[PDB]
Design a protein around this ligand. Sequence first.
Ligand SMILES: COc1nc2ccc(Br)cc2cc1[C@@H](c1ccccc1)[C@@](O)(CCN(C)C)c1cccc2ccccc12
Ligand SMILES: COc1nc2ccc(Br)cc2cc1[C@@H](c1ccccc1)[C@@](O)(CCN(C)C)c1cccc2ccccc12
Ligand SMILES: COc1nc2ccc(Br)cc2cc1[C@@H](c1ccccc1)[C@@](O)(CCN(C)C)c1cccc2ccccc12
Ligand SMILES: COc1nc2ccc(Br)cc2cc1[C@@H](c1ccccc1)[C@@](O)(CCN(C)C)c1cccc2ccccc12
Ligand SMILES: COc1nc2ccc(Br)cc2cc1[C@@H](c1ccccc1)[C@@](O)(CCN(C)C)c1cccc2ccccc12
Ligand SMILES: COc1nc2ccc(Br)cc2cc1[C@@H](c1ccccc1)[C@@](O)(CCN(C)C)c1cccc2ccccc12
Ligand SMILES: COc1nc2ccc(Br)cc2cc1[C@@H](c1ccccc1)[C@@](O)(CCN(C)C)c1cccc2ccccc12
Lengths: 81, 81, 81, 81, 81, 81, 81, 81, 81, 40, 41, 207
Amino acid sequence: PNAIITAGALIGGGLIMGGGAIGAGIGDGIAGNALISGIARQPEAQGRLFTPFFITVGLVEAAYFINLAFMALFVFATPGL
Amino acid sequence: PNAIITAGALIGGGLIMGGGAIGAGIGDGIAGNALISGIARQPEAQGRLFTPFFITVGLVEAAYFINLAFMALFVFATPGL
Amino acid sequence: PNAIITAGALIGGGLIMGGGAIGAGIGDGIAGNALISGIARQPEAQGRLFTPFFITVGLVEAAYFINLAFMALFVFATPGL
Amino acid sequence: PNAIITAGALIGGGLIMGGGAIGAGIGDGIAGNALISGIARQPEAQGRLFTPFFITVGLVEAAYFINLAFMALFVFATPGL
Amino acid sequence: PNAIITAGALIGGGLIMGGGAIGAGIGDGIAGNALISGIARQPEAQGRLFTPFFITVGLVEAAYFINLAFMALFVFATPGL
Amino acid sequence: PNAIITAGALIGGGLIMGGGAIGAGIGDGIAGNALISGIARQPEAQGRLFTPFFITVGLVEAAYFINLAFMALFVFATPGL
Amino acid sequence: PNAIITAGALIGGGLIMGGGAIGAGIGDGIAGNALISGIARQPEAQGRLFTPFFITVGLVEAAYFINLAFMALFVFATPGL
Amino acid sequence: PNAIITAGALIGGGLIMGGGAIGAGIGDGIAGNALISGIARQPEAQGRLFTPFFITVGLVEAAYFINLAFMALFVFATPGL
Amino acid sequence: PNAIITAGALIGGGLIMGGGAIGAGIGDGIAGNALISGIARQPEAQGRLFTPFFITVGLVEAAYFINLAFMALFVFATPGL
Amino acid sequence: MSIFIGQLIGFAVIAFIIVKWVVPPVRTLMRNQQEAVRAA
Amino acid sequence: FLIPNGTFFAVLIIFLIVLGVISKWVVPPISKVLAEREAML
Amino acid sequence: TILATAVTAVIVIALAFYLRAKVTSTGVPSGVQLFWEALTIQMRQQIEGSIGMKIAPFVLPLSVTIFVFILISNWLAVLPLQYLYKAPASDINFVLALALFVFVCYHAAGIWRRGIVGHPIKVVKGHVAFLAPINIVEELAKPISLALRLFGNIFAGGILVALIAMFPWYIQWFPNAVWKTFDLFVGLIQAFIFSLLTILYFSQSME
Ligand SMILES: COc1nc2ccc(Br)cc2cc1[C@@H](c1ccccc1)[C@@](O)(CCN(C)C)c1cccc2ccccc12
Ligand SMILES: COc1nc2ccc(Br)cc2cc1[C@@H](c1ccccc1)[C@@](O)(CCN(C)C)c1cccc2ccccc12
Ligand SMILES: COc1nc2ccc(Br)cc2cc1[C@@H](c1ccccc1)[C@@](O)(CCN(C)C)c1cccc2ccccc12
Ligand SMILES: COc1nc2ccc(Br)cc2cc1[C@@H](c1ccccc1)[C@@](O)(CCN(C)C)c1cccc2ccccc12
Ligand SMILES: COc1nc2ccc(Br)cc2cc1[C@@H](c1ccccc1)[C@@](O)(CCN(C)C)c1cccc2ccccc12
Ligand SMILES: COc1nc2ccc(Br)cc2cc1[C@@H](c1ccccc1)[C@@](O)(CCN(C)C)c1cccc2ccccc12
Ligand SMILES: COc1nc2ccc(Br)cc2cc1[C@@H](c1ccccc1)[C@@](O)(CCN(C)C)c1cccc2ccccc12
């Protein structure tokens, strides 16, 4: 009954947030790596390099929140209960 | 009953969206890294680099969104139901 | 009954596209990264650099679509059902 | 019985934290590399780089805690139990 | 009955094609990155540089095919059914 | 009965500690790459590069041993039981 | 009965081939990258680099074959019966 | 009965050792890469790089073998039995 | 009965060999990448670079051999049972 | 008994390997330091 | 196998015994020797 | 277990005895002199590199006794006593005593330097105040990291040497040989790691 679907839902919702956190963390770290290694060359780059970074971090994190939304959709008001 | 398949479906959709989000985050990150690194060097170049980056992301998310779409297939229509 | 096989099928099929999207996102991100770095370090070579990338991506996506097709085989036309 | 709903949860939560740890573990590193290498190349910049770093981690950690938070939500509060 | 066997077999076959696709995408990408960068830094190289590429690709894609074969063995000719 | 909960607690804790080991190892290694390369390219920096390295390793270990911490809570206390 | 053992056995054989293929593809690519970049930087360097390469490949591919052997043991010999 | 718990414990300990393996292998590789590269950049640096090297290799392994110390605890000394 | 523990054992051993092969392949590959690039950079350093390379390979292969041993343990000795 | 037979075979193998490969460089480095002390 | 017993204090005592042995006997003569080698150099 | 450690204490003590007998600063050194001197001078160059011998000299004897103690333990674990001996680190008690003593020593030295009222807060605030709550885990991580590592690796051997024994003897000699071959190296490396991270924790505890 509903219990089995609920357990499946929590497990899928764990997978979704886990993969999302992996992608987000590693991508944000890579973007930060580019930013830190660039701001190392010339300081004047700061206000410039912030634009692509917030784009990259903007896309990368754009995945997590969306995944996070679907996470709730699995665990709260689960499909097919 | 179809409860079992529904649990499997939620878990499968979670796998789809998890791998998709890992790919999307890490891909947007690796692309943004090249962008930030090629804009830290020679910033007058930036207007070129937006053409391939938006191409690369265009592919990465092309993988992600469709993954999400197949997720919507597993979770809201549950093939085999 | 058929429920178990459909559940296993959906789970396997989700794994297929999860792995496929990891591969596709990270691979085409690395490809785009080389493209961005090259079009930065050598814009004259732009028209050259596009020839291998469409090849590289072509293989990466060549794997993923192949996966999605087998996904359709696992989910809709489940073997052993 | 209802126990099943908890079992998956203790599984699901692990996927939130464990994968999160990956995003936490690698991102804190990929960033520090760009920091460390800077301290190797441009020693005087040790102060400047700290801001591009703290933001990168500031984003990466922002994921980890969030996952941690929802981890408790799966484990202690057990939605739909 | 044997149904559980087929379910496990589909799960396994999905894992095989999944790991295969991850390896294929990411390896073809890491190769194509060297290719794009090497045809940027040395534009004439296109002729010789394809040969090492066809080697590494040959090893990556083969790992996929041996994988894609064994999946077909798991699902369509299930061992131990 | 509560046996299922115990199995799930162990499995989830294993996921936690395993993802933690993945992230912690890869992060400590990526940090050691910058440390070793800096100490290879300039030895006088050995005094200063040790500073950010353990600032970053600390951020990585402070993930591992946190995941491990929750893992103990999973295995010995079993939160839901 | 043996049914559960055989289902688990297929799942495990798939996990083995999956991890093996991830490792094999990514490692063969990481090797082909050094090979391609070197053969770009030095056309006449081929006859050197293939020696370290077939060495590295020989290790990575070995990790595959061993796994490919043990997968058979899991799936076509079914230990524990 | 206890059997369910023990199967779960084997699975969990397997996840522990697998994550530890991924982490430790990839990290030892990333460290050896910086070491080999430094010794290529400065063939006489070998006596110098062992210090920062084993600092890393340990802090890396400080996950894997720790996981292993817990792996036995799950497999040989099953908690909560 | 014992059959369930055996199935868990096959699954766990699969996870162990999976993580082992991922780590071993990617690590031997990264080390080989460093070696190939260094031998492309210093045709004469071959004999000095074979030393740190075999050290790194020895560490990673030690990880993989320990993993293989615990795989034999799970699959053939099957703790518990 | 059997595991002891294998153990002693293995210990002979390891002693052989160290004696042949590891010992020569170790003793040569020790002797180099010894002679370098012999300077003073 | 992660539950200590009195073995702990025994190993702490023997380790401190070795530490005293070393601190008194080994370290001083070797430091003096390093200084005297730096002199003769 | 206590006997497995007593054997190592007596070997190290007999070696210090042999040094006390042999030492010559004028003449040509025997083996024991060169081994002792190389270990002491390596650790001395390390401590000099971070803290300076003049501010924290008291760490050198601890570092060297730790290195010799655990190195001899692991090497002795190799000798073919298989059939009573088992590596002591295989037991949590030994590694706990060692890591806990290192922890209490360097933290008490930090307190002795800055004062009981001064060192805790400075350690918490650490390198960056934004990391203040992480530093605690960075602090609490320092001892545990030392222990469960030295355990986790040597235990990993103690089981494996037994698991290989599962084989028949003819198969057995090959994996046991390879394992012990590389176990010498791994134990030496973990000893160097323990000592070096002890030194670095001392250093950052002072500043
Ligand atoms: C960086 O911030 C963002 N950038 C985005 C960029 C693109 C898109 Br399309 C969505 C974005 C969404 C956000 C945040 C946000 C803040 C408030 C409301 C809604 C969304 C976020 O979702 C990011 C999570 N990250 C860090 C993993 C968040 C959620 C919950 C708690 C947070 C706590 C702290 C910080 C961020 C927190
Ligand atoms: C950047 O946006 C895109 N670029 C693409 C490029 C190529 C291809 Br072929 C498909 C693309 C698709 C999209 C979005 C889209 C556009 C239109 C309709 C549906 C979806 C997206 O799916 C991307 C998610 N990313 C950011 C992780 C999305 C979905 C849902 C919510 C979003 C919220 C915010 C941003 C994007 C959001
Ligand atoms: C460019 O795209 C491709 N390149 C390939 C390269 C090699 C091989 Br062998 C197959 C390829 C196949 C395709 C598309 C395709 C689909 C159907 C028919 C033909 C080609 C694709 O499947 C790619 C999705 N990607 C991201 C995995 C697709 C599906 C659905 C919506 C799309 C929307 C937009 C773009 C592509 C879309
Ligand atoms: C380049 O392609 C190869 N290289 C190999 C290299 C080594 C070995 Br040993 C086997 C190789 C096999 C192939 C193809 C093949 C299949 C059947 C028969 C012959 C060759 C392939 O299987 C590769 C999939 N890749 C791209 C993920 C394939 C299958 C299905 C659809 C494809 C569509 C497009 C391209 C390849 C397609
Ligand atoms: C400083 O680091 C941070 N930055 C953040 C940035 C944005 C957001 Br929105 C949350 C952030 C949260 C933190 C930490 C923190 C410190 C103090 C209190 C709360 C949170 C942390 O998340 C560390 C995780 N790291 C190591 C992978 C944490 C969470 C839970 C328990 C902890 C216990 C001990 C130490 C750290 C603990
Ligand atoms: C290069 O290939 C190798 N390198 C090794 C290196 C070290 C060791 Br110790 C064993 C190695 C073994 C091999 C092959 C081999 C050669 C002969 C007999 C058995 C196995 C291989 O197993 C490799 C698969 N790779 C490419 C993913 C293989 C098996 C099955 C079908 C193949 C089809 C095509 C190519 C290789 C095929
Ligand atoms: C290079 O070989 C080694 N180097 C090591 C270096 C350090 C350490 Br500590 C252990 C090492 C162990 C080995 C082999 C070995 C030797 C003896 C017994 C068991 C294993 C090996 O593990 C290597 C495979 N690698 C690539 C994963 C192996 C395992 C299984 C089947 C093999 C078949 C053929 C060849 C090697 C096979």
